[PDB]
Amino acid sequence: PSDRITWVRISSCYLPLATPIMTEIAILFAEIETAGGHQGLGFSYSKRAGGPGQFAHAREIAPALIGEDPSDIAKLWDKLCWAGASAGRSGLSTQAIGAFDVALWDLKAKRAGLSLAKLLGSYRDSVRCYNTSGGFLHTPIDQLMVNASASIERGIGGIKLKVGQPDGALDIARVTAVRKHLGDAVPLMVDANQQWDRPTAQRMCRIFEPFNLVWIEEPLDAYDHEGHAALALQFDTPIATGEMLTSAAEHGDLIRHRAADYLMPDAPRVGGITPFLKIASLAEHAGLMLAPHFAMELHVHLAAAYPREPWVEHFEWLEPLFNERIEIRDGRMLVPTRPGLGLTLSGQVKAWTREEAQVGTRP
Amino acid sequence: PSDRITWVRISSCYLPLATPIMTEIAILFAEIETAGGHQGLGFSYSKRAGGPGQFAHAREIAPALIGEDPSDIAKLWDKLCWAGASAGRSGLSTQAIGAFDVALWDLKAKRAGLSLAKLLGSYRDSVRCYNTSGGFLHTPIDQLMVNASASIERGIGGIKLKVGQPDGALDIARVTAVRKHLGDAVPLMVDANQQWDRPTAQRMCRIFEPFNLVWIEEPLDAYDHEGHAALALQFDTPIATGEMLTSAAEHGDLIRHRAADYLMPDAPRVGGITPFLKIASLAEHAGLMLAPHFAMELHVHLAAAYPREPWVEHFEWLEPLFNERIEIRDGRMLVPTRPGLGLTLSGQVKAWTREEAQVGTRP
Amino acid sequence: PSDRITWVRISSCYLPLATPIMTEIAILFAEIETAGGHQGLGFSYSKRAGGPGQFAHAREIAPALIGEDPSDIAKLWDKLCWAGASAGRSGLSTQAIGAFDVALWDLKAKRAGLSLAKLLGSYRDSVRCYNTSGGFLHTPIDQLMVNASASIERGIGGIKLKVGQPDGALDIARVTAVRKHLGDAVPLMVDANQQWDRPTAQRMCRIFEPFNLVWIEEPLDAYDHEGHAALALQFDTPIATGEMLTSAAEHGDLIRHRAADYLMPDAPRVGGITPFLKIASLAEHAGLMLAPHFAMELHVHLAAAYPREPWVEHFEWLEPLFNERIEIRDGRMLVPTRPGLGLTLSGQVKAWTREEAQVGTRP
Amino acid sequence: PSDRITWVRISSCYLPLATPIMTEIAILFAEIETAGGHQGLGFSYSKRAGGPGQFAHAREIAPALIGEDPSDIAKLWDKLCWAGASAGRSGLSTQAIGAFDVALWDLKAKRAGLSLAKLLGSYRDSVRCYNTSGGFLHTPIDQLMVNASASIERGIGGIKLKVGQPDGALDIARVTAVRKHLGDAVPLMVDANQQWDRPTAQRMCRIFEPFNLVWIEEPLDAYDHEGHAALALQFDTPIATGEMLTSAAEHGDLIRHRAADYLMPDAPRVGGITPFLKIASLAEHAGLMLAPHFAMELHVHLAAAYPREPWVEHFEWLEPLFNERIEIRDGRMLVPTRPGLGLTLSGQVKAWTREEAQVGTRP
Amino acid sequence: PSDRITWVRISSCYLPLATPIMTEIAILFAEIETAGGHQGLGFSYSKRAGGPGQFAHAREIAPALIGEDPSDIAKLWDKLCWAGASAGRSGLSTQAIGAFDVALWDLKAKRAGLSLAKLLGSYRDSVRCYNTSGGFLHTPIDQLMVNASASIERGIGGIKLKVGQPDGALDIARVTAVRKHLGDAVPLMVDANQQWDRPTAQRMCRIFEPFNLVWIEEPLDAYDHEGHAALALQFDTPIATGEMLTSAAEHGDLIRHRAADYLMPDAPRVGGITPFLKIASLAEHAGLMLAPHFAMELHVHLAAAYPREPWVEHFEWLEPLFNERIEIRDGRMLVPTRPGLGLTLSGQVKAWTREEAQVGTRP
Ligand SMILES: [Ca+2]
Ligand SMILES: [Ca+2]
Ligand SMILES: [Ca+2]
Ligand SMILES: [Ca+2]
Ligand SMILES: [Ca+2]
């Protein structure tokens, strides 16, 4: 083999959130080291229930990696999946596999002395970014307006507003208020978080049309593909969805329905970089736009490798976990130039680790 | 509410197999009790990796059941799924949910003093059954021949032979040998266990055509829907598949492709009775036949409720876990008449339990 | 068996209407009792011609229920259908079967000490409701306006206005008048009762778009599925139809055409709860909304069991037939908590019964 | 940038064939070197007219590579294509681009100290191989028989026989003769080289069915997708095609028609490794088998990276151009383990070079 | 044969542009003469990279024309294509073939003493024309406004404006300015040159709707057929595309998608008149409009032969190459009446020729 895995360590780290949304996020870290002295770091996560399950499964299948050639990433993804075949090809088991998968990609990239973006091959050195500016449905427009202004001032390229509350007139007012404040030149998008039924989504999308939003995210249930397809066919405003999906197959179904103008795959959630690339390949062929969701630390690299100009969300919740940081400038997020994912665990991770296990002999 | 859940207990029981094939099966038991004194028992399982993950997730979401009306089964399935939304609608998380789901159905049936089959409404009091007679690819033909003949004399209604070895001539020989021994009056089916590629499956199905087998099971990868549909369109022999799928959505895709003459949903594997019923409704409408896989203790009830004559496999591995037994006669297994699933945990379960947890106050 | 039917009584009851619409409605009541002392009550109906036919058929097939296990509801639906096979799977014969079907469901629910909603499993304890406030095309807007206001005051959650008269400008005026009176906050829907041809429906739907109605009901002939599908594709306003259909097959065709945003199945009209559930399963899978038509006494239970928020019409014409009543509060209809359908025949039913028959020996 | 391209050299080398079939093959070699001291070698080719055109275009666009980051392979493929946009996305211009593309991949692999197969990630360390044993339509049966048997004793895993001559009876005779000589255990395939019209292909495939050939290659015109799809739907024997196609788009069309059981993309012919990977992704998703055509020195690496067991032709014509060799044993060719493609130009290349050019300053 | 080719001369002529756009255009001229004394002139071209490749290939395959019957044009197109089969059916090789193809058509037309338009059969003696009036995105509206006015004054029938710059508000302003200047009676069209992504194209097309433009050209990537089809389905304004395509197959795909209201095939770019006619036949059958791109000297003849009123661009860049000129009158371009294409090489061609070759003996 090109090398061989000799040690693996998994940790279940509970990241406390500065502000309740959801008071914490369970992060599954996977560390892999080889006889050749190469090392990789990867992770998966669970918002709400899922952390314990991901860790337990990861611990059970980890031994299957020992002795294997780390360069055969897809092959190993398949081997770990087969090791837990009755668990399926999506959900907790493949998310656990994803932590290992990301680590192997990190390791291969470092082996070449290249950032993950350069190993895959990039199309740009910076990616369009946007943020919520710490805005929620319960955030007084006044505060959200001043926070969004600050974000723009520090380099954010767009603002995503939370909508989808029983009183639709409220959202329209809030959005109207933000648009008047920032100006027509600031890109604006909304996220309904699956709060609308088909009739309501139909009416709200109609109202938002004049706003020229970048996109309307998750207007319906994440699984209502025909519903999303119907909205995309009817309205000029792009429809964005997919962040809730957990496998290449689900994204394939969404794509088959032409249910999204902007596909929002979540690498950790779908099983890692390996399945994410298969999804990106399908989206590319279908001529769609890409807007990866969550984990910017990983997605900035994946987005950089997509043919068409993508959008990545500037999200700072995971920063305390790492020693590195992402920098933003003139509406764009810079793609890190360091080898691999360019991440190392902060000293704070230890204090937040509730479970851990390892197998093999460390080099 | 009709009632209120007050106590829940989950157990991870490792069933040792008298004959390695894999030397054990992880069973997740869920016990539910209410303020009204009602009780239910359900379970899910994992062959190979999966047991630890299912238990861990079940333990984390169990508290969400306390205080809820046990009669709103589908509603609670959704609540538990939402409680772990980032985990998706299939795989380990929904299988954990399935243990609770089965228990709720068991409890509702008992509440009406009806077997699960009668609660759902049955079409028959006994179901066609078949077995492998402890035969595997490595079992010497002559042994499998006397074993099969023995199963027939005990009342089994059919024999499923394992095939799919590199030397197709061998399988053809073994099947020919079995057919000549038992006679043309004994129903025969084969299981290739996803071992054939499209070209090989094409040639083997061609050869088996004259045999008039009941079905050819899993000739291709469980996810090659187009491949299976092509075989079903070409050959007279029914194609059976679906045992590997873990969600209603995956079965829906298989059904959309018309990839199976006999659909083989596995209740515990797809998330319980609730999603299984949705799958059965889709199969019924599509005019397909049903042959549920594994867990006869549960599937005999579900099969009894299907409009068209189904087939259920009679296999003994799980018996040690329960105090009750399935009866077979004249080629069919009798649908139990006791309330609910008609199962209670044996004293052996305790000794095989490696993990357990409970929440709430037992009535 | 779980039990066995020993007595059956059918009655043809003619319900006189307080105000001509249609001066009466023929109701077919079915009573079923078992050796175990269990009892069930169900019914079907005919607006205009149909009462005599339903009763005659019910009387002829009733004997087929004696001795049968009441828990095998679907099986018995099929047996009664086969008993009159040349009559088909829809229309008068299956509507007669439906009376028996509803009774069997009522009996099974009572057996478990659960309301019908809880036996099926509910998603809500109350359902959105609406009414016409005794409004017809010939009702002076002035009166309809004050009546609608009263309905809202007593808890009704929406108002359905009758439209579809030769003078379209009239309907627009009437609707404009009602909207201005009640305010934009009161949900409003219209019912054209199949009075428009494709061109007219096209023009009227266009005009109603700004109104933001909950739905436009039966704009075209109940059987013009392509016509309805075209309207739904073109307009934001939901299209509602299906109330005239009499079988799962017809609803399946409507669904295949994507001819309705809100499907309006009528349990009694399609053959009872058994076929209604098959229809609801198809609508659920297609991602549609549900708005059962007529018989709120039965549909409130069925609606409660649907995944997505349905709408049920508050209709008081059938009240004199029963001793129980439905209560409405804050725009919602409360789902009864009593066992089964929660209905018993009033003493007035006897005086209105024109035909009756029974078979078997009462327990 | 990760690095920077500083020098590029292109050579048009005419490979003389020891045996006319066409007496030579024009090979376009591309050498790329960077400021960081990294180097890559790639190539494209033309059988018959094409060599001069490929070189001329390569020379004209080569300057566009100077100063660029060699790691952004896909990006540069697009830049060179845009540099000659009026030339399209297929044919001579993209084949010229492919020589550079292969060199960039070779360079990236070497950068990581990995073979091309390991950089991409492999599923196997050896690939099934087959050869023609120097047999053509004019080769006397008995000679081809001893030649084939010889290839088998040296380790070849299969024999491809050339067919498609006006006298079909002859082919059938020759194939029958070969089959009887080698035995039923030696895999056999035939290549009709687009010689049959639909009617003839239909009859010949019918006759070959009993033979159980691995595949029937190019039975019809390379562009008759409907024709090929019809044959594949009708016959058990796999249909193989695609070797003549020159772009991802053409392969996509073939795949859309389901016109091939075995897709035969030719990396150099379609524009290099970059477009080849896109084609492989499409074939993988469609559930097809892979059998890359020509250039085993390159395809052995690409085939190793495909999920399902592929077939690669072992043919010796290009060996004189390189200092390295492919090893075969037990019916499979070993995937080279050296860095990158594992190829270096032999001293003979210089003598066969008719044209060459370079740009930039060599490090 | 009807005659036989005895001499062929190819020249690579670099046409310098009066103003940078692109400072020159490579033109490939092909001259063919027969034993019968007949002669033909044709050409192909490359904007940016492509000239050297086209010439090199043309030189290599030219010998294949000697001795052949010039009247069998399609047959010879196929023979030359086969002569370079590994080069494919599009791109540089077929463009080289196209130069010869045009010459053969010119020769056949002259043989009959008919213009090319009359040989094919025409529907009109003049064709609607339009121009850019030397306008580019960087041209100050003031100048573009006065230039467009002059064009109209000298007989041009329409104005095409360049759009597709980052600042969409700019294009709208420029177009608004031009429309106000020339008046609503002057046909206006825009060309976005593939500068918009789907979302942007969607928004810009919406804005342009009120303008009643003749068409919106290349709003998206030339290969995004689904994208173009979606725009055409949604908007009243015709979508025009196809100028970038290089083969009948690509145009066929575009047509299959109903991706264009106005198809813009480029004869030289797709391989000559032979493939252009196949494309025109497909467009005619699909009921589309035709707007050939570039080379008016050739397209005026081809456009004249199309059933529906086409549009041809008045483009003067190629004039210096020929001794003849096209005349425009009352918004239409007159179809030349001279034999064949009606073109002869100017004395300036010699000075601009960088490469040339000939084969055979001149008559
Ligand atoms: Ca859209
Ligand atoms: Ca079949
Ligand atoms: Ca609609
Ligand atoms: Ca086939
Ligand atoms: Ca249009």
Side-chain angles (χ1 to χ4, degrees), chain B residues 202, chain D residues 231-233 235-237 261:
Chain B
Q202 191 72 30
Chain D
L231 288 167
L233 177 59
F235 302 105
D236 287 351
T237 304
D261 295 291

Side-chain angles (χ1 to χ4, degrees), chain A residues 46-50 52-53 56-57 60-61 82-92 95 194 221 223 244 246 256 269, chain B residues 46-50 52-53 56-57 60-61 82-92 95 194 221 223 244 246 256 269:
Chain A
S46 300
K47 283 190 179 179
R48 292 177 183 293
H57 197 70
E60 183 175 31
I61 65 179
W82 280 110
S86 74
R89 294 188 181 181
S90 70
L92 298 182
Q95 293 175 348
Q194 313 180 66
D221 179 73
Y223 289 88
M244 299 302 292
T246 59
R256 181 172 67 72
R269 190 168 301 201
Chain B
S46 301
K47 284 165 122 173
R48 295 186 187 295
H57 196 70
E60 181 175 35
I61 68 179
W82 280 109
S86 80
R89 294 185 178 182
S90 68
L92 299 181
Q95 299 179 337
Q194 311 182 65
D221 175 77
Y223 290 89
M244 300 303 292
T246 59
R256 183 172 65 74
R269 190 168 299 198

Side-chain angles (χ1 to χ4, degrees), chain C residues 267-350:
Chain C
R269 190 168 301 201
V270 304
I273 294 167
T274 289
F276 183 100
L277 294 178
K278 294 178 179 178
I279 294 166
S281 173
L282 287 177
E284 200 294 307
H285 186 66
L288 308 180
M289 302 290 289
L290 196 74
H293 182 260
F294 193 59
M296 59 175 196
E297 290 79 1
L298 168 59
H299 294 311
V300 58
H301 289 284
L302 297 171
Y306 197 71
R308 307 187 182 79
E309 285 294 313
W311 281 93
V312 169
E313 189 192 358
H314 180 279
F315 176 77
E316 81 291 327
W317 301 5
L318 309 189
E319 299 186 319
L321 299 173
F322 313 114
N323 299 132
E324 301 74 14
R325 293 286 183 285
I326 297 295
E327 57 187 312
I328 55 177
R329 193 175 62 207
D330 301 314
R332 296 211 162 211
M333 179 185 286
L334 306 195
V335 178
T337 59
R338 303 179 297 278
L341 273 58
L343 303 169
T344 54
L345 305 175
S346 73
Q348 182 67 67
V349 171
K350 283 180 279 292

Side-chain angles (χ1 to χ4, degrees), chain C residues 114-162:
Chain C
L114 302 172
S115 57
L116 176 59
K118 292 292 175 171
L119 170 66
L120 299 174
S122 69
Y123 279 94
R124 59 197 63 80
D125 297 316
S126 68
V127 183
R128 291 189 289 184
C129 67
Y130 64 95
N131 80 342
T132 64
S133 292
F136 292 119
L137 283 161
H138 58 74
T139 298
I141 314 172
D142 334 290
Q143 298 176 51
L144 199 165
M145 284 170 71
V146 297
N147 287 177
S149 295
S151 295
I152 297 300
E153 295 297 334
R154 56 199 194 70
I156 296 296
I159 298 295
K160 189 175 79 172
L161 300 173
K162 295 289 189 181

Side-chain angles (χ1 to χ4, degrees), chain C residues 86-107:
Chain C
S86 74
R89 294 188 181 181
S90 70
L92 298 182
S93 65
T94 48
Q95 293 175 348
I97 290 176
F100 297 119
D101 186 74
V102 176
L104 291 172
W105 274 101
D106 179 46
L107 187 161

Side-chain angles (χ1 to χ4, degrees), chain B residues 209 229-239 261:
Chain B
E209 282 282 67
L231 288 167
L233 177 59
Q234 178 64 43
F235 302 105
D236 287 351
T237 304
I239 299 304
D261 295 291

Side-chain angles (χ1 to χ4, degrees), chain A residues 54-69:
Chain A
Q54 283 182 5
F55 176 79
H57 197 70
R59 180 176 57 193
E60 183 175 31
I61 65 179
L65 288 172
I66 303 169
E68 293 290 345
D69 188 338

Side-chain angles (χ1 to χ4, degrees), chain C residues 201-220:
Chain C
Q202 192 71 28
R203 300 283 168 56
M204 292 304 279
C205 285
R206 181 64 64 190
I207 293 171
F208 282 132
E209 281 280 84
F211 283 91
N212 290 310
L213 300 173
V214 178
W215 70 56
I216 290 176
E217 185 180 334
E218 306 273 294
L220 303 169

